[PDB]
Paper text:
TNKSs are ADP-ribosyltransferases that catalyze the transfer of multiple ADP-ribosyl groups from NAD+ to their protein targets. The poly-ADP-ribosyl groups act as signals for subsequent ubiquitination, ultimately leading to the proteasomal degradation of the target proteins. TNKSs are involved in the regulation of many cellular functions such as telomere homeostasis, mitotic spindle formation, Hippo-YAP signaling, and glucose metabolism. TNKS inhibitors are often based on molecules with a dual-binding mode to inhibit the catalytic domain, addressing two subpockets.
The resulting structural model showed the electron densities of both fragments. Although all hydrogen bonds were conserved and recapitulated the overall binding mode in 3k compared with 1, the phenyl-containing linking region of 3k showed poor electron density, possibly because of the flexibility of this linking region. A different linker could possibly resolve this strain and result in a higher binding affinity. Inspection of the X-ray structure in which fragments 3h and 3k were simultaneously bound to the catalytic domain of TNKS2 confirmed an unfavorable linker geometry, resulting in attenuation of the main contacts. This cocrystal structure prompted us to investigate this region and seek improved linkers to circumvent the unfavorable linker geometry. Next, the 13 selected molecules, together with 1 were docked into the binding pocket of the TNKS2 structure cocrystallized with 3h and 3k.
Residue numbers in the entry:
A (entry chain AAA): 952 to 1110
B (entry chain A): 1115 to 1128, 1137 to 1161
Amino acid sequence: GTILIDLSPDDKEFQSVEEEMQSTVREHRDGGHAGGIFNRYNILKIQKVCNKKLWERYTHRRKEVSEENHNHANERMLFHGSPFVNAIIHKGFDERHAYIGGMFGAGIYFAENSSKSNQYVYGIGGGTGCPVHKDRSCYICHRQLLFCRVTLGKSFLQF
Amino acid sequence: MAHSPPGHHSVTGRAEYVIYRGEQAYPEYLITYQIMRPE
Ligand SMILES: COc1ccccc1NC(=O)c1ccc(NC(C)=O)cc1
Ligand SMILES: O=c1[nH]cnc2ccccc12
Ligand SMILES: [Zn+2]
């Protein structure tokens, strides 16, 4: 039961998410191999994802994490890029669909840099690029990133 | 690594962040976009 609320470009909530997307673009060591060559985005659509069931599921977990982390959730707004964005907005994030051989194990990965999450939109290392043109640096095909509430709680530092 | 280490709720890779339970993230905003061709 997911509702998408289309935000107007003149809405401050749209502009806030727009600016976080544009301002967190970085130069990448792969020189654009994974996510393409760009300094900015064409922001076409920002929709608020409204799902009561998935939100209560989130806030319930957040409370449990707070009580185990000195009454603080350590909540962060972070980007997620994935070929499975359509499934995530309808059924929620699902650890059961995580690849076991990730750098930090079978987990769901987030970035504070939009350009980092952009590298995973078409798969690991940008996969084979956009479906139509097989181009990781495609300027034509429309991409989708999630800007997510993430409860980190007590976060284990790893190199 | 299958779950968070004991007493922990996430991993900070160094910066990327990893959770091991789907219910610890909510996909609040769906952003449709293109990467811009540099002029
Ligand atoms: C097939 O997929 C799904 C289908 C339905 C619900 C959820 C999902 N999938 C995920 O929530 C999901 C997110 C991220 C990763 N991987 C990394 C690298 O972060 C894997 C699975
Ligand atoms: O959003 C992401 N999706 C998939 N893999 C990642 C790896 C590192 C940082 C972010 C991501
Ligand atoms: Zn394309």
